[PDB]
Write a protein that binds this DNA or RNA. Structure first.
Length: 289
DNA sequence: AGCGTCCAGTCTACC
DNA sequence: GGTAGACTTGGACGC
């Protein structure tokens, strides 16, 4: 992907943007901390930074950042290096995905922080999106570090070291419920060095699954989401109830277990299963099931 | 009405 | 070996 990048004032401008849409990306069910501003731009808190992203045609405007942070953080965050046009063309050979793609032509898989993704999807279990978004912002406000942008105070996502000194009940004050003990166990295990997140990409996909599932409250799904949305292993297909029913209704025309639904997609899509999972998800929400 | 009953991945208990 | 039922918080839907 070829872009013309320039620093201009307190913002960074990227021209030559393709296969990208803010609304579609931030509402594909992968992230939770990005919110729409009145002009249609999005403000979010990731990697201990607060930025506003705005897309005007093929021009991206990232406010409150510098050329150092753009290449070090945001280039890889929005996965700008990858060609989604080739991915869309390849997947479109299946007629079901072609129909799914036309509704989400701008979905890109974000490369989010390992720790935030882990805790975010620990919170996601048996939980609707609006509540997940609320609990995460509670954790941020309660235990995060304050940063300001345009007069308003925003909060970073709490690190493991910033969570270990609190009891379960204190964590439970974020309205997370029974999930509090899982967050407490997750924070304890990373803080002790018992689970290394920086070196986690060195292991195979199956090894990573096993490493993360050692944390109480992390099963296959949470582990899969961390693997896809944070590690960037795209040959995975994280199966939630929604995608199960989407793959059921549109392909097999029967009913299935999360295991066989998963093995059907990885077989059919291969190294592009993660992208396919995104197009079907947003298409699933667009059709209303 | 307002009060109820159901439900949005993982663990635990028990096969 | 496998899974049914419990699980916080809270919003939807019944009558």
């Amino acid at each position: 992907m070829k872009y013309n990048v320039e620093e201009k004032g307190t913002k960074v401008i990227v021209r030559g943007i393709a296969d990208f849409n803010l609304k579609e990306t931030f509402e594909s069910g992968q992230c939770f901390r990005w919110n729409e501003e009145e002009d249609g731009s999005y403000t979010g808190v990731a990697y201990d930074r607060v930025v506003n992203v705005k897309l005007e045609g093929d021009t991206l405007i990232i406010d409150n950042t510098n050329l150092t942070d753009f290449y070090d953080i945001w280039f890889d965050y929005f996965d700008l290096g990858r060609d989604y046009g080739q991915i869309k063309e390849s997947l479109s050979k299946d007629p079901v995905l072609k129909e799914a793609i036309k509704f989400g032509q701008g979905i890109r898989i974000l490369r989010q922080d390992t720790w935030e993704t882990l805790v975010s999807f620990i919170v996601s279990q048996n939980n609707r999106i609006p509540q997940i978004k609320k609990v995460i912002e509670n954790l941020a406000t309660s235990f995060g570090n304050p940063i300001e942008y345009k007069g308003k105070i925003y909060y970073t996502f709490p690190k493991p070291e910033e969570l270990v000194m609190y009891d379960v009940e204190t964590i439970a004050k974020t309205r997370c419920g029974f999930r509090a003990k899982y967050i407490f166990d997750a924070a304890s295990k990373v803080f002790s060095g018992e689970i290394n997140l920086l070196k986690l990409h060195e292991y195979s996909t199956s090894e990573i699954r096993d490493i993360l599932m050692t944390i109480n409250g992390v099963g296959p799904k949470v582990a899969d989401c961390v693997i896809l949305y944070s590690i960037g292993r795209y040959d995975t297909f994280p199966t939630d109830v929604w995608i199960k029913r989407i793959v059921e209704h549109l392909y097999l025309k029967r009913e299935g277990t999360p295991v066989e639904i998963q093995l059907f997609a990885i077989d059919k899509f291969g190294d592009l299963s993660g992208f396919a999972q995104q197009y079907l998800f947003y298409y699933g929400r667009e059709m209303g099931k």
